[PDB]
Design a protein around this nucleic acid. Structure first.
Ligand SMILES: [Mg+2]
Ligand SMILES: [Mg+2]
Ligand SMILES: [Mg+2]
Ligand SMILES: [Mg+2]
Ligand SMILES: [Mg+2]
Ligand SMILES: [Mg+2]
Ligand SMILES: [Mg+2]
Ligand SMILES: [Mg+2]
Ligand SMILES: [Mg+2]
Ligand SMILES: [Mg+2]
Ligand SMILES: [Mg+2]
Ligand SMILES: [Mg+2]
Ligand SMILES: [Mg+2]
Ligand SMILES: [Mg+2]
Ligand SMILES: [Mg+2]
Ligand SMILES: [Mg+2]
Ligand SMILES: [Mg+2]
Ligand SMILES: [Mg+2]
Ligand SMILES: [Mg+2]
Ligand SMILES: [Mg+2]
Ligand SMILES: [Mg+2]
Ligand SMILES: [Mg+2]
Ligand SMILES: [Mg+2]
Ligand SMILES: [Mg+2]
Ligand SMILES: [Mg+2]
Ligand SMILES: [Mg+2]
Ligand SMILES: [Mg+2]
Ligand SMILES: [Mg+2]
Ligand SMILES: [Mg+2]
Ligand SMILES: [Zn+2]
Lengths: 69, 106, 93, 50, 93, 248
RNA sequence: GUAGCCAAAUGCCUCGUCAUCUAACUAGUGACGCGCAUGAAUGGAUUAACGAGAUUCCCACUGUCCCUAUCUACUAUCUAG
RNA sequence: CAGAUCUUGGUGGAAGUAGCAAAUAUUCAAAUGAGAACUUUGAAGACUGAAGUGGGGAAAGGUUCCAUGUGAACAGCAGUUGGACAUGGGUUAGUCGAUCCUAAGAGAUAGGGAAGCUCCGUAUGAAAGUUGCACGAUUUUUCGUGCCUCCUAUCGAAAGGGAAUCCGGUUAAUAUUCCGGAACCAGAAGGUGGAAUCAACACGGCAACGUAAAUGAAGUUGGAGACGUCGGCGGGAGCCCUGGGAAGAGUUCUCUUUUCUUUUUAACAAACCAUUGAACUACCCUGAAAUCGGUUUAUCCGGAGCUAGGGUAUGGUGUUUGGAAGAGUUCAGCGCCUCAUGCUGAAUCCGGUGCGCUCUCGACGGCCCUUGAAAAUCCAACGGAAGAAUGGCCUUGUUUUCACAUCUGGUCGUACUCAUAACCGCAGCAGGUCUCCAAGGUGAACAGCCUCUAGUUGAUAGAACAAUGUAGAUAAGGGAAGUCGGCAAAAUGGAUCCGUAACUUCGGGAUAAGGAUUGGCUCUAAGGGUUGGACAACCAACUUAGAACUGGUACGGACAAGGGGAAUCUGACUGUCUAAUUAAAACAUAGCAUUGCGAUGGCCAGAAAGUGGUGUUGACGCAAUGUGAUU
């Protein structure tokens, strides 16, 4: 598992071809984790905002598979 | 309290049977079998451990990038900094003495 | 305080082995554990490592010296060196 | 011991197989005296000796 | 029971089975006292209450079992400072 | 009777314990450089050799014919130190640690690890504190006379090499062992020769000294030189016996 | 047969003789020594410390004894197998 | 055949006898059943008491494992039950082992012995060659000679060396192997991306050294693998203990803001990092120290450059995170034949502690006539082989020791027991058999004693209380009169404070001897840390000494736990042996002495040998004897 600290970095990994799916995890503390499954690693980005989470979810590639936990 | 068992069939406290205790996300106390500790390369002239290089088992060194296994200097990763400095000064002074002894031989 | 009038380091042996034997061991043990002076560096950091081998501490002169079993130099070795030096200096000239 | 060689394991399989009752129709044959056998080995009683 | 023992009950001579050394190693007491005195000496030097010349004399005195506790050291420092300033006042006058 | 203990020391459990030994202590193969000139080596290590009183010196020499360095194992002479230069050959100087033909050194010099035959790589005066003395040369048909640690006088060819100085490790035997356990540890790294049961403590089947209703030998313990194995026990071919009062 | 040592784990005679301890000792210890047959690395003498070694005694202690008694458990005993 | 302690087989009296008594212990109800002291369930009473009657392994066994049945034989009583019997089922790996490596050793080959079976030998008296170069070879590459160079059989470790896996779940029965999720290693090809190179293979930093990459052939050199033991000191992890909150439970005449349980976080990845715990540990720079300073529990360090100031490296079982709450745990409800056993809510939080325990790491100290494997394998350097981009730019090689991606990882083992019933001992035998984890109280303590988790309640039973036993207690007065002899037993015993003879090798003797004290409660004094403006309100603490009061004139209240002294013989001491009648004064030992021998040798071996040991040796040595520390 690897953590991604930049939204720009996370979007670039998603646009890659190995990026199969994404996961949305909503924690009790109103923080949102975006998890990207590549061949070798699972990449998590922690978004501490609901507004930012919505924009990031809309910022994803349209063909990316985003799954809700 | 919770007591543990070896996870392998090796039943003896040998140096290849090193363990440490982990507490798991199931609230289980159990062993984790671990390796012997690494060793830093040592200077070929003085035996001192060489700076800038991690302590690893011998084959783990095959996985590092080149610059992690050496120092950017002559004999880097093979001689210490002070050993190299002795070699440079010694080589120069000895060569100069060979020059004067050749000059005074004629 | 003194803690011992005679046996010194040999007090570890207690009353065993005989007084003469403990006294002979005492003289040698004081020698073999003494600090001696390094002629190459001038420090008194010369201690024995196994019977004829005398080592030095510090960053300088990490050399090892071949010496006597219980002292750094023996009288026989010292006398031999001067004998050898005299013989060397008489065929030289 | 559960640490065992293949050759040992093959022998154990064979030993277990010979350690079975004879089917009755074998002893029902005309002219057969296979009614009882002295080859019923048991693990605690008679040892294999490799 | 442990609460009572905290207040000092159940700890008389009839309640001890180990030696005093078995109960409380004297080497631990000494190590604690030395670490306490050395920390005090270091604090005083860092604040300028004592200078390195007095610190060195007191350090070797503390190693030699001169002060039973922090108080004995503090009174001794106060006595030493009072005497030194007296010589300074004598000389400066 | 049965095979006595001395007859069983032919191998097996009586072999030397050699796992902890780093190499035999040898002079260096007599080569062109040593025959005609000298060659320089540097002392790399001075090390303890289990089962040997004297320390050993690992000395690095350049190979004259190939790009490579050859490490030699010498018996350290007293005074030797790591980083010292040692010189071996006919033209080497008369300094402690150098290796020279005995014919090239004056009468009276103190030497060690001396060859019996030129090139045997060291036989005489090798144990701790021991040495050999040069007694004289006979230039016609070059033979050098030397005195050995036993006191014997020997004639070696004046091409046999020797090391200048005395073997290091000093007066080791001056210290009482004081304890069975210390003798145990001394011979543990040597061979299976300790402790020793006395012959008279045995039965007649075990030893010629065995048996009897008191512990005694019976016949004389000075036995002839030509005794068979199994009867060659006690004081073999003794010229004399008893406490000597003044010898030579 | 020197220095030593001894009726000694070595003395037959022998329960040697004298002294000591005991009410009383063929014990023990100390002396003595023409020692059947002690004695010098076939090691003599001495010896602190150590000893599940041998030997004599004293204090403590006590059913070892005077002189036996009492109590518990398991047997023995009777029953089924 | 009457005999032979005759042979083989069968069968008697002894006899319903000896006996089936070690390891504290069983009881009530129910179910099942023809039948229950022995099966199963519930309840009670107990035990092992973490150096286990607990949880695993190595060796050995080999199916004993699991389910369903059975109950002739076996389970020295019983049997509805069983490790018995019958029918079926059960062991899943690139990451755990083996496999690879070498060790003591084994052992082909050369060669030599031997009538021969075979013996010696292991680069050995051998033409004992896998590896290093492109000279041909189109043309973008491993087949022909070449000149070359100190290479090498193999076997030998399920505890040594060694590439790589963790958590949660799952079965009647396997699991680091299956499932879910999350990783890692090795090899191959080169699939993209990036980096350097306009002529060549990067920059930064005074330096220690740093980075996302940063060309490097032969040869050489260096490193890792790779190493004893004891002692204390410092840190970490798990455990232990403690203060609150929460959820559930136990108790509740009275009391108890109570008592108990749960309150978890892996491999791997990233960034920091002496902060918060553990460094001035090592090194570098500035600077130049006597009024010498620094400094550890332990006295080492400095003009060969101290103190100080600032840096560099080493880096997790530390921190902050990803993994990861979605898992696990605890609790509360809903459908209610319910089905795929689904669905819905809460909590899983915040603090502290250490001469503690187990493991581990770090820096050290002591000791040795003792100085404490090897090899496979991996890495680094020194060196400079080789390369071909060029038309000021659309144009190659390298790097895959930089990132992401692809393929592949065979074969054998894997159930279960590991022992008062799975092994050996004729057996389900009070014997024997290597090792890992290890809670609370008391206490010095892994002692004894009690308890929690776990396990077990299994050792034929019932009744009775005769003699004589075995095991365990007590005894008036006397106190060794007993006896070969204090044999056996008694007495002593912990700790604190007093006190302690001869003799002595000066170390000891010594816990000599010989005295006193010891509970509970209520206080007093002294001894250390965090922390607010000469000081200080808490919090976090543990000792030691003393006083008063008090009661069974008691208190190491059980448990635990020396009797002591005066002498003689003898062996100096620690050590060793007659497995199963001898443990000693016997043996050994240090010490002392003597003997042989300088290698064409001494001692020992072999049938022989081009053979072996001492010998990786050399008189401060090897070999052969005697005596037995010292004096
Ligand atoms: Mg005998
Ligand atoms: Mg004979
Ligand atoms: Mg007498
Ligand atoms: Mg004599
Ligand atoms: Mg009877
Ligand atoms: Mg008949
Ligand atoms: Mg007849
Ligand atoms: Mg008959
Ligand atoms: Mg009966
Ligand atoms: Mg008990
Ligand atoms: Mg109990
Ligand atoms: Mg089990
Ligand atoms: Mg069966
Ligand atoms: Mg493995
Ligand atoms: Mg192998
Ligand atoms: Mg299982
Ligand atoms: Mg298993
Ligand atoms: Mg068996
Ligand atoms: Mg009485
Ligand atoms: Mg009475
Ligand atoms: Mg009395
Ligand atoms: Mg009497
Ligand atoms: Mg009588
Ligand atoms: Mg007794
Ligand atoms: Mg003895
Ligand atoms: Mg016996
Ligand atoms: Mg016996
Ligand atoms: Mg003896
Ligand atoms: Mg003597
Ligand atoms: Zn020096």
């Amino acid at each position: 598992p690897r953590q991604i600290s930049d939204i720009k970095q996370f979007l670039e990994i998603a646009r890659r071809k190995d990026a199969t799916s994404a996961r949305i995890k909503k924690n009790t503390n109103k923080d949102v984790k975006f998890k990207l499954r590549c061949s070798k690693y699972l990449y998590t980005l922690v978004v501490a905002d609901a507004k930012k989470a919505e924009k990031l979810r809309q910022s994803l590639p349209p063909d990316l598979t985003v799954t809700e936990v | 309290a919770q007591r543990v068992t070896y996870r392998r069939r090796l039943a003896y406290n040998t140096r290849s049977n090193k363990t440490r205790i982990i507490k798991t996300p199931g609230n289980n106390i159990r062993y984790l079998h671990i390796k012997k500790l690494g060793t830093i390369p040592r200077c070929g002239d003085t035996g001192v451990p060489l700076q800038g290089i991690p302590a690893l088992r011998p084959r783990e060194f095959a996985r590092l990038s080149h610059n992690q296994k050496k120092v950017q200097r002559a004999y880097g990763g093979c001689l210490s900094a002070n050993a190299v400095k002795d070699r440079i000064v010694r080589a120069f002074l000895i060569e100069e003495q060979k020059i004067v002894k050749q000059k005074l031989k004629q | 305080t003194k803690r011992t009038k005679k046996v010194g380091v040999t007090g570890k042996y207690g009353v065993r082995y005989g007084a003469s034997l403990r006294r002979d061991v005492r003289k040698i043990e004081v020698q073999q554990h003494s600090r001696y002076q390094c002629p190459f560096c001038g420090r008194n950091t010369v201690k024995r490592t196994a019977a004829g081998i005398w080592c030095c501490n510090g960053k300088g002169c990490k050399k090892v010296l071949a010496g006597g079993a219980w002292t750094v130099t023996t009288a026989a070795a010292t006398s031999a060196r001067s004998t050898i030096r005299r013989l060397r200096e008489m065929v030289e000239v | 011991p559960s640490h065992k060689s293949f050759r040992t394991k093959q022998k154990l399989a064979k030993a277990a197989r010979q350690n079975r009752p004879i089917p009755q129709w074998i002893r029902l044959r005309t002219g057969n005296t296979v009614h009882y056998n002295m080859k019923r080995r048991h693990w605690r009683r008679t040892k294999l000796n490799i | 029971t442990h609460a009572a023992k905290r207040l000092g009950r159940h700890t008389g001579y009839g309640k001890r089975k180990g030696t005093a050394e078995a109960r409380m190693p004297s080497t631990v007491v000494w190590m604690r006292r030395q670490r306490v005195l050395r920390r005090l000496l270091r604090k005083y030097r860092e604040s300028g209450k004592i200078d390195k010349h007095l610190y060195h004399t007191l350090y070797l005195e503390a190693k030699g079992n001169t002060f039973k506790h922090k108080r004995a050291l503090i009174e001794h420092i106060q006595r030493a400072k009072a005497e030194a300033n007296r010589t300074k006042l004598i000389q400066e006058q | 009777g049965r095979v006595i203990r001395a007859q069983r020391k032919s191998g097996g459990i009586f072999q030397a314990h050699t796992r902890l030994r780093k190499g035999a202590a040898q002079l260096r193969t007599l080569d062109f450089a040593e025959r005609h000139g000298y060659i320089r080596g540097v002392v790399q290590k001075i090390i303890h050799d289990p089962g040997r009183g004297a320390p050993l010196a690992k000395v690095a020499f350049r190979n004259p014919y190939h790009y490579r360095t050859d490490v030699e194992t010498f018996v350290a002479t007293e005074g030797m130190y790591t980083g010292q230069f040692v010189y071996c050959g006919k033209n080497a100087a008369l300094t402690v640690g150098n290796v020279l033909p005995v014919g090239e050194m004056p009468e009276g010099t103190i030497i060690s690890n001396v060859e019996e035959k030129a090139g045997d790589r060291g036989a005489l005066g090798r144990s701790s504190g021991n040495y050999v003395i040069i007694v004289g040369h006979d230039v016609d048909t070059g033979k050098t006379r030397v005195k050995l640690p036993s006191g014997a006088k020997k004639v070696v060819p004046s091409s046999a090499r020797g090391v200048v100085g005395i073997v290091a490790g000093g007066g080791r035997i001056d210290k009482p062992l004081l304890k069975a356990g210390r003798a145990f540890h001394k011979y543990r790294v040597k061979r299976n020769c300790w402790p020793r049961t006395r012959g008279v403590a045995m039965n007649p089947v075990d030893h010629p000294h065995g048996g009897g209703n008191h512990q005694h030998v019976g016949h004389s313990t000075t036995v002839p030189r030509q005794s068979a194995p199994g009867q060659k026990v006690g004081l073999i071919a003794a010229r004399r016996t008893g406490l000597l009062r003044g010898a030579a």
